[PDB]
Amino acid sequence: AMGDKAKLFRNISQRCLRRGSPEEALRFLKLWARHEKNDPEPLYQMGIALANLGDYQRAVTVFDKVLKLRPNHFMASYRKGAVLLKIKQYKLALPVLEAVVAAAPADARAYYLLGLAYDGDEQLEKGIEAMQKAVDLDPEEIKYHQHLGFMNVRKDDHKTAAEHFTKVMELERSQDS
Ligand SMILES: [Cl-]
């Protein structure tokens, strides 16, 4: 069972996150982690805070801690994959993100991140496949059409690129009134 000290520290780190400042919160998340060792939740939370601070490399190594405790932690992989992609470590992000999508096969955003990771790794064809899936799962999103258009310009398929761009145009008009 969760100890009183741990409840207190959780309680405070929530005030600190919701009141803006995750540098303070981070100190209380570590206190919580100290009292409830082998609870993945405070570690997972530190990972989030570190990512928001911009300490991305440090965030990854904390998300690995939570993934050692809970190998299938679906959200820990999601966020790890997302920062790995921001750091431009594409090869490493691919297996992480591919696991996210095998757990949440209708998550358009997972597939979008996956597409960007493949594209970064110069696997254009695989990235199109993934970004296409994002577009099928959420056809009103401008961003996914936009990328899928550019991927197709590089593939020299200007017809389907133009389709996606003329769609980006359409969404922009109809998201005023
Ligand atoms: Cl792109």
Sign of CA dihedral 53, 57, 61, 63: positive
Distance in Å, CA 5 to ligand 1 centroid: 47
Residue whose C-alpha is closest to residue 99's, from 132, 137, 126, 67: 67
Distance in Å, CA 175 to ligand 1 centroid: 22
Inter-residue contact 107 to 100 (CB < 8 Å): yes
DSSP state of 53: H
Distance in Å, CA 148 to ligand 1 centroid: 7
The count of structural domains within the chain is 1
CATH number at residue 161: 1.25.40.10
Q: How many Å apart are CA 16 and CA 161, to the nearest integer?
A: 46
Q: How many Å apart are CA 159 and CA 142, to the nearest integer?
A: 18
Residue whose C-alpha is closest to residue 66's, from 42, 50, 49: 42
Q: Cβ contacts of residue 69 below 8 Å, gap of 6+?
A: 38, 40, 43
What was the experiment behind these coordinates?
A: X-ray
Range of the domain at 48: 1-177
Identity at 177, one-letter amino acid code: S
Inter-residue contact 106 to 134 (CB < 8 Å): no
Q: How many Å apart are CA 76 and CA 101, to the nearest integer?
A: 13
C-alpha distance across the termini of the chain, in Å: 53
Token output for 45: 């939370």
For 117, 129, 146, 160, the CA distances from 125, given in Å and listed in that order, are 12, 6, 16, 14
- Residues with Cβ–ion distance below 5 A, ligand 1: 147, 150
DSSP state of 154: H
Token output for 159: 């017809």
